[PDB]
Design a protein around this ligand. Structure first.
Ligand SMILES: *[C@@H]1O[C@H](CO)[C@@H](O)[C@H](O)[C@H]1NC(C)=O
Ligand SMILES: *[C@@H]1O[C@H](CO)[C@@H](O)[C@H](O)[C@H]1NC(C)=O
Lengths: 269, 269
C-alpha cells in the first residue's frame, strides 16, 4: 500500500509512458499539446503539457520517444517508447553484456540497450540540459514501458550527478545489466528509481538471472489483474536485489500482464 | 440506469462475445472448457461452460464463432465473432440493402450481413435445436460484437417463432436494414434484443440513415468512457427508433470506443 500521492505519480508516468506509443507524436511541432488516442493518457492531456523535442528512430537502436514540458506538474519528462511489436522484440531479445564503466566501474549492461542509448545520449542530454536551464525549478523524470523503461533506466543512471535529480519511473522493464549495475541503481543518489511491475509480466523476467542479470531494488509490484483497475492497496513494495515475491516468481509469465499498467500500455486502441 | 440483473447479463454476454475473438477454440474439440487469453472472459471461465460446436470462416460470409453450453447460468449461447481487422472492415463496408421478405414483410436488410447468415443458417439452426432439445430448461442466447452483433441480430430475427425464445445481446452492432426491419426488431415476440452501444462508437452509426437504414428500438447506451469500467448507473435506455442522444449524436465518432464494451472486446491482449 503506497501513498495516494505516489499512486498518482505512478499513474501519471504510466500514461507518459503509454503516450510514447499512442501519442500523435511522429514528429509534430515542438510546443504542441500532448494527446493520445484511445484514452491512453488522459492525465497527461489534462496537464498543461507539450512536446519540447520528439524523436523517432534515432541512431543505432532507432530510439523513439519525446521530451515534454509539463507546467501543471512542473516536470520535464523524457519518455521512451518500447518496441512496436513487443512479441517479436521479446523473441529476438539478445542477452549480451558489454562493459559500461563510464557509467559505473564493474558495470556491465545489456549490450543493445546501452548501445542504443549511447548513440543518442549526447543529443538528448543536450535537450534535457536545455530544458533544465529554462526551468531550473522543474523535476526531471525519465520514464518508459518495456524497452522504453530500459532505455529510461540506463539514460538515468548515465545522466545523473550533473546538477539535477533524475527520477525514473519504469513500467515492466527488462533487467538492464549485471549485478554491479543493479547495486548502483539501488543506491545512486540524485534521483529515485521507481521500478514498477505487474503480476506475471514476462518482460521484467528477461534477460534471466542465468545470463548474468540482476534487478535493482526496491520493486513496486501491482498485484491486481489484467484489465482490472489498480487501487493503492494493490501495490506492494519489494526490497532486495533480485528479491522474489513480486514479478520474480516461479510461474508462467504472461504477455498480457505486460500490457496493463494502470491502464493499457504498449498498445493502442 | 438499468437494473443490476440486466447489467449482470450485459456484462456476461459482452464476455461471451469477447470470447469469440480470444478463446483458444480454433479446432477445440466439442466438450472443452471455454477459456480466454488476456482476462477477456472471466465470468465465462467462472461458469461451467464448454463448447458445443466451434465454427470458423463458415460459408459465404466467412462467419466465425461458437455454440456453448453453460450449466451454471443455464444457457445455450451462440456467439459470432466480428471481423479480424475491424478498421479495414469498417472502410470496406458497402451500404447495399437487399429485400428480406422471408423474415418480415417489406423488410430491407444489409446485403452482406443478410447473405452471410443465410449461407450458414441451416447448419446452425440444427445445432441450436439439438441443444434446446437436450436442455429444454435453458435460455437460448445469441450474442456478438461488431459484425458478430449484426449476425446475431439477423439470426435471432430469422430463427424466432419456432418454439423457444431467443434472446439477442449485440455489442456495437452496425445498422442491419430499413425502417421496416427496425420496426420488425422493435416489436417481434419470441425474444428480446438487447442492442448495446458505447459512447460515440462508430459502428452503430453505420450504414448511415442517409442510405436508408434504421435502428431497432430500444438502445442501451453505455456513457462511461473507453477503458473506464461500466456500472449499472452508466447505462441509459434510449427509447424510439433512430432515437438520438444516445450513440446517435451528430458529434464526431471514434474507433477505440468500439473496442471497449464492459471490458476489452474485438481485440485480444
Ligand atoms: C492546449 O492545452 C492548453 C492547456 O493545457 C490550452 O491552453 C491550449 O489552448 C490547448 N491548445 C489547443 C490547440 O487545443
Ligand atoms: C472444466 O470445467 C469444469 C467445471 O466448470 C471443471 O471442474 C473441470 O475441471 C475443467 N476442466 C479443465 C481441463 O480445467
Amino acid at each position: 500500500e503506497v501513498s495516494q500521492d505516489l499512486f498518482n505519480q505512478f499513474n501519471l508516468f504510466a500514461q507518459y509512458s503509454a503516450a510514447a506509443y499512442c501519442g500523435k507524436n511522429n514528429d509534430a511541432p515542438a510546443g504542441t499539446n500532448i494527446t493520445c488516442t484511445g484514452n491512453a493518457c488522459p492525465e497527461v492531456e489534462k496537464a498543461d503539457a507539450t512536446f519540447l523535442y520528439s524523436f523517432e528512430d534515432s541512431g543505432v537502436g532507432d530510439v523513439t520517444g519525446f521530451l515534454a514540458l509539463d507546467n501543471t506538474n512542473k516536470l520535464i519528462v523524457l519518455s521512451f517508447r518500447g518496441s512496436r511489436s513487443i512479441e517479436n522484440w521479446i523473441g529476438n531479445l539478445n542477452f549480451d553484456l558489454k562493459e559500461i564503466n563510464d557509467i559505473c566501474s564493474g558495470c556491465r549492461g545489456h549490450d543493445g540497450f546501452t548501445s542504443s542509448w549511447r548513440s543518442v545520449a549526447d543529443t538528448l542530454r543536450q535537450k534535457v540540459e536545455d530544458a533544465v536551464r529554462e526551468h531550473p525549478d522543474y523535476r526531471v523524470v525519465f520514464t518508459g514501458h518495456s524497452l522504453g523503461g530500459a532505455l529510461a533506466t540506463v539514460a538515468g543512471a548515465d545522466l545523473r550527478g550533473n546538477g539535477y535529480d533524475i527520477d525514473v519511473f519504469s513500467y515492466g522493464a527488462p533487467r538492464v545489466g549485471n549485478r554491479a549495475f543493479a547495486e548502483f541503481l539501488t543506491v545512486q543518489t540524485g534521483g529515485t528509481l521507481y521500478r514498477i511491475t505487474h503480476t506475471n509480466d514476462i518482460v521484467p523476467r528477461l534477460p534471466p538471472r542465468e545470463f548474468g542479470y540482476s534487478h535493482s531494488s526496491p520493486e513496486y509490484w501491482i498485484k491486481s489483474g489484467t484489465l482490472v483497475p489498480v487501487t493503492r492497496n494493490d501495490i506492494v513494495k519489494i526490497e532486495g536485489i533480485d528479491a522474489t515475491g513480486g514479478n520474480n516468481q516461479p510461474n508462467i509469465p504472461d504477455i498480457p500482464a505486460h500490457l496493463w499498467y494502470f491502464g493499457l500500455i504498449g498498445t493502442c486502441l
